[PDB]
Each structure stands twice: as C-alpha cells, then as structure tokens.
Amino acid sequence: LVLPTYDDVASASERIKKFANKTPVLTSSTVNKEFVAEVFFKCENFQKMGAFKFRGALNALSQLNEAQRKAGVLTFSSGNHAQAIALSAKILGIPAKIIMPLDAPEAKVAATKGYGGQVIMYDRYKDDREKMAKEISEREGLTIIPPYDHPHVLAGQGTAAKELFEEVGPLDALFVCLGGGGLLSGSALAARHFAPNCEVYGVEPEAGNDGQQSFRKGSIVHIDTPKTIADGAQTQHLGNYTFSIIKEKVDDILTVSDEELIDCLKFYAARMKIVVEPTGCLSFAAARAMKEKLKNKRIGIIISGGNVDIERYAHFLSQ
Amino acid sequence: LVLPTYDDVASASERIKKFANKTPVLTSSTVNKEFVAEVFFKCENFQKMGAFKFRGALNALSQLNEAQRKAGVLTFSSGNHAQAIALSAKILGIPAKIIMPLDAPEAKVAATKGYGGQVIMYDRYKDDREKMAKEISEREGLTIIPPYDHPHVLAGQGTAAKELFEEVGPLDALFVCLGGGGLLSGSALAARHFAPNCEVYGVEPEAGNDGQQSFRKGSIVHIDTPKTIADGAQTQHLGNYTFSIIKEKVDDILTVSDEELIDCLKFYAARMKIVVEPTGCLSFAAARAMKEKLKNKRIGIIISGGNVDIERYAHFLSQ
Ligand SMILES: *C[C@@H](NCc1c(COP(=O)(O)O)cnc(C)c1O)C(=O)O
Ligand SMILES: *C[C@@H](NCc1c(COP(=O)(O)O)cnc(C)c1O)C(=O)O
Ligand SMILES: [Mg+2]
Ligand SMILES: [Mg+2]
C-alpha cells in the first residue's frame, strides 16, 4: 500500500478551504487547574455537519474527475461520514448512495437524507456492510469512498490536528478518538510534522479495543461488533492504510468505559458549554484518566463530533 | 446622570484584555438558509465563568483603588454577575460578599462560593435586594458593584458587541437579551459606533416586559417579579443609567414566550452543538420570530450565557 504523508494532509487543507470551518480552539480554567497543565480543545463538533468527517469527505470527492462525479458515489458509515459525504456530494453535484446501520442515531440518518443522500440500511452487528458496498457499487457502477480506510479520506481528517498545531504550536500529547483509524492516522501524520518527538494517543471504547489489541500484536485484530454508546467507534477492525500509519506514528492506544464517556459528556456540557456525542468524548476521558502523566505539559484534545439525538443526550445528562 | 459613552467601552476592552476570553463567533448554514441571511453568533457562553458578565465585573473592579480593594465589595445578582464578581475579586485579591436569590440555579450559587464569594440569600419575589445591599454595605463599609445599573459595569458588557463588530463588520440588526439593561445599553453604545444607522433590539421574556413598557412609555415601568425560566431576566425594572441609554440608542424591545425559549435552547443544542441557558436564548428566539424582516441582511446575535443546572437543562431538552 502506498501510504499518504503529511504532504497529503497539507494539500487537503487547500482542497477544503472553500467550504470547511476553521473550527475554534477552546480552553478551560477548570481543566488547566485540575491537570496542572495547558489543555487545548479542537472543536470539530463545530465543523460543517457537526463532525470532523466533512474534511475527509470533501478532500476525497474533490479529487474525483468529471465522469466519476456524474456516475455517483457510494459509502458505508455509522452516520457522520454519511452526512459528510451527503453534504460534500450536494456541493459538488454528485449523486450519493449511503449504507447506514439501522440503529444509527436518528439525527444522523435524518441529516443524511436531508442532504439528498439515498439511504439503505444494514444490521450493525450481523451484516457485512463492506460486502454490501462492493456488490451495490459493482452492480451500479458507483465509486466507493470508504469512511476511513482510504488515503484521501484519512489525509483530510488530519487537517483538524494541522489547524490545532498551527494555532497553539507543538503539543506534548494529542488525544484522538479511534474507530477505524482515519482520524487517528491523519492526526498522527500532522502530529509528526509539527511535534515529531511528542506523544500521540488513540482512544477506543473498552468493549471495542480491537485497535489497542492490533497495536500490541502488530497485526489487525478482528472483534464482533462491540456494544457501546460510542456509536462512531463500533468498528470490528482497523483499516489497512490506517493501521499501517498508526503502527508507526502512534505511541499508545487507551480505552475508557461508557460510564467515563457519560461523565465526560456531562463535563463538556456543564463546564465548557458544548454538546459532544459519546464517541467525541473518548479523547478527553482518556486524558483525565492519565492526568498524572500530563502535569506541567501542553495537551491537545480532539472533540470529534457532536451529533446525537437530543432525547438520548438529555438521557445521558440525567445520569 | 453622567452617561458612559463608547469611549468607556473602548477603555474597558483594555482593562479586561489580560483575563477575558475573546469568544468565538459561530455561524450556521441551517440558520442562514432559513433566514435567507448571514447570522453571526457571539458566544459569551464561552466567556470566563460562562456568561458575558465577567466583562463588566472585571472592568468595574479593576477601577477600584487600593483602599477600596482591601475594604471589599458587595453585590446582588441572579447568579451570573455573582460568579463574575467572585472570579474577578479572586483575581484581584478583593474580598467579596454576594446576595443571591434562593431559587437561583444551584450551579451559579455553587460556582460563586467556589470562587470565594460569601453568599447571602433573598426571596426573589418578595424581598427588596437593593435595600438589603445598601444596609449591609453601609454597615460593613463595602463598595457596591451593581449587576447592571453602573457606568463601569454596562460599559464592560459592551465589549462583547465591540468584538463582534470588529470581527464581522457592521450588522443590519443586533439582538440582545434584556434584564436590567446592562448588556443592552453597553451593546447599544458599541453598535452606534460601528453601525450608527442600523438596528439594535432588546428582548425580554413576555412575563417580564417591563423594559418594553418603559421603552414605549418614556419612563421606567415597575412590575412584580415575573415568573419565567429566563432566570437572568426576572428584573422588576430597568436601571437608571441603562434606560437613559436604551431610550436613545435602541430601536425596539421584543418579547418571546418560555415555550419559544425552550425551542431555541433545543435548536442551539441540536444544530449548533452549544449549551445556552434560557435567558441566553432570548435574542435568537426574537430573531426567529421576525425573520421576514431579516431577509438578505446581516444579523448579530448575542449568546449571553450558558450557566444552567444540568438536570434542568436535560429537562428542557426533553420537552
Ligand atoms: C468513520 C465513521 N466515524 C467515526 C467517528 C470517530 C472515529 O473515526 P475513525 O473511524 O477512526 O476514523 C470519532 N468521533 C466521531 C464523532 C465519529 O463519527 C463514520 O461516521 O462512518
Ligand atoms: C445582571 C444579571 N444577569 C443578567 C443576564 C442577562 C441580562 O442582562 P442585563 O440584566 O440586562 O444586563 C442576559 N443573559 C444572561 C445569561 C444573564 O445572566 C445578574 O447575573 O446579576
Ligand atoms: Mg475499536
Ligand atoms: Mg424585564
């Protein structure tokens, strides 16, 4: 596999500049005092469509030629890449078919349809969504734009970390949410450019620690779909492109419980005044767990997204 | 009364630069499409202590001399000015006594105490908090720093609008939440400097439309404490300094129902991913109600604060 490099992240910044949001970086006095450090939060929950995914989607679709754009694209996603592709596709006038899990947050499915995406569903725990994707794409002549295991997609996700480092400088540690590895691999490429000798940490829900196992083992570990409220991290295994990069440019993979995610979600709401979906709480939850190692350092936290069903969010806040 | 001018808002920017947050401005594609306009949201819910109040508090306390700082300050507040004064006072080593309503959000009372403020309570609907303030201050030799009816306080609140105009330019209309009039009067001073011929609108909860009545009548109208979820706008009447300015530099005062505030709060959470307290939803709620007048214009919305009890917020999101 020909792996993308920081050069691809840099070019991605150019391709998305026209429509993507240069999301703000927030800080918290409470957090800094508790951690005895300087923590910076990159708010991708404020990105177009509510998650970092718009970056990878636009970067990928922008590189399709005229014929490919007219023919249409297909993708499979837990929900955010789905919305990202739908929005990017609308902007570029590209027809888009999207395969989503039946138990995906209603808000993510609704938004995808609202953007003009044609949605087909699958069972997250029993079906092989990639098998479905291949067949539908092969049968309808559609270009598949994977949710993470693709050079253009992962390179694009890396622009969030790129922007963070350009705004606050190199950081001793960067915490990143981990599902298939697109956000983490892209972030790692940017991290090694701006802070080659610092730390990059991926974080998965404990029930879905396939990435952590792969990292320790040296090969991709496959697990049954994990049951966790982190709906954007229920992947069965890491992508091939992403793992290739993660294995080389990531220092460690951590895990946190759903209980910890909920406490983090409440903290974000009560102390930082921002809405973050469970999956977007992985990074901060892990940072809190290892705060002792972060004393007197500068830390970067990626808030990956904020797309949740309000009713469910209200439920979490009530725990 | 010697009314403050934009010059005082400009100087206030200098006095708070050391500790205040230059809060971000957010935009929403959904909002722009619905309004057929460009709307800009000044996020004071991201200000130090979660509300715009830190601005006026720091501006006022920073202008107290050595003897006044050592002697201590006293204030009365629904909760946000309380926290703002407590925090500012801690920064400057000033002892602070704060009178708060017994039914104020627990989070606002807790934060005030956490900042070192000595809290005394009053009944929001039956007591005369200013009578209490005068006596305690006269008896203990404390300098009173009112929550809105003071030149330094209102001038400081105006720095939020100042920053908004400096970032996005003059705006056709600016919507501002209205309680005692500090935020509105300060905002109006900044507005008339950057956009002298544009529109400035104040917004009160319908049950507490004393400000609207005063604006129409030409004199201060007094009402019994209104029952509304907008806990930072339950004032019985406008301040004297604030009304003097509002009467001259504000175009109209609008009102919205609690039902409209709740719908706005849910919108902020679901579509913009931010936590906003009921009172901070007044401005946007009113803008939505008069969207027809906003077509093809540029609008400014002040998100005044985000301090709410999580349990209560979750309750609102569930409506
Ligand atoms: C791609 C997938 N979304 C994932 C997601 C992550 C994890 O990203 P990676 O899968 O490793 O690239 C972290 N936070 C959030 C909020 C989301 O959605 C999809 O939507 O298809
Ligand atoms: C001063 C008072 N807080 C009020 C408040 C307003 C209204 O401000 P004005 O009273 O007119 O200056 C709007 N939004 C929020 C969130 C708050 O708190 C206090 O806290 O004492
Ligand atoms: Mg996993
Ligand atoms: Mg009123």
Bridge partners of residue B74, in order along the sequence: B97, B144
Per residue, what are the HEC states of chain A?
A: CCCCCHHHHHHHHHHHCCCCCCCCEECCHHHHHHHCCEEEEEEHHHCHHHECCHHHHHHHHCCCCHHHHHHCEEEECCCHHHHHHHHHHHHCCCCEEEEEECCCCHHHHHHHHHCCCEEEEECCCCCCHHHHHHHHHHHHCCEECCCCCCHHHHHHHCHHHHHHHHHHCCCCEEEEECCCCHHHHHHHHHHHHHCCCCEEEEEEEHHHCHHHHHHHHCCCCCCCCCCCCCCCCCCCCCCHHHHHHHHHHCCEEEEECHHHHHHHHHHHHHHHCECCCHHHHHHHHHHHHCHHHHCCCEEEEEECECCCCHHHHHHHHCC
Closest Cβ opposite residue A314 in set B50, B273, B317: B317
| Whole-angstrom distance, CA of residue B179 vs CA of residue B189 | 17
Neighbour count for residue A135 (Cβ, 10 Å): 10
| A56 Cβ inside 6 Å of ligand 1 | no
Bridge partners of residue A203, in order along the sequence: A177, A254
| A81 Cβ inside 6 Å of ligand 1 | yes
Name the CATH architecture for the domain at B52-148: 3-Layer(aba) Sandwich (3.40)
Please determine whether the domains at B1-51+149-319 and B52-148 fall in the same fold group of CATH: yes
Q: Is A20 part of the contact surface with chain B (CB cutoff 8 Å)?
A: no
| Whole-angstrom distance, CA of residue B267 vs CA of residue A218 | 45
Which helix (H) or strand (E) covers residue B17, if one does?
A: none
Q: Which residues have a C–N gap over 2.5 Å right after them in chain A?
A: none
Which helix (H) or strand (E) covers residue B14, if one does?
A: helix B6-16
Domain ranges of chain A: 1-51+149-319, 52-148
C-beta of residue A94 within 8 angstroms of C-beta of residue A73: yes
Best substitution site from A48, A148, A153 to test ligand 1's pocket, by max atoms within 8 Å of Cβ? A148
The alpha carbon of residue B282 is apart from the nearest alpha carbon of chain A, in Å, by 17
Q: Is B53 a catalytic residue?
A: yes
- Measured from the CA of A80, which atom of ligand 1 is nearest? 20
CATH class of the structural domain A1-51+149-319: alpha beta
Closest Cβ opposite residue B48 in set A29, A45, A306: A29
| A181 Cβ inside 6 Å of ligand 1 | yes
CA B186 to chain CA centroid, Å, is 10
Bridge partners of residue B175, in order along the sequence: B201, B301
Model resolution, angstroms: 1.7
| Whole-angstrom distance, CA of residue B244 vs CA of residue B182 | 11
Per residue, what are the HEC states of A261-277?
A: HHHHHHHHHHHHCECCC
Q: Does the annotation place B304 within a ligand binding site?
A: yes
Nearest CA in chain A to B114: A30
In terms of Cβ atoms closer than 10 Å to its own Cβ (0-12, 13-18, 19+), residue A22 is: middle
Residues with CB under 6 A from ligand 2: B 51, 53, 77-81, 147-148, 177-184, 232-233, 277, 279-280, 304-305
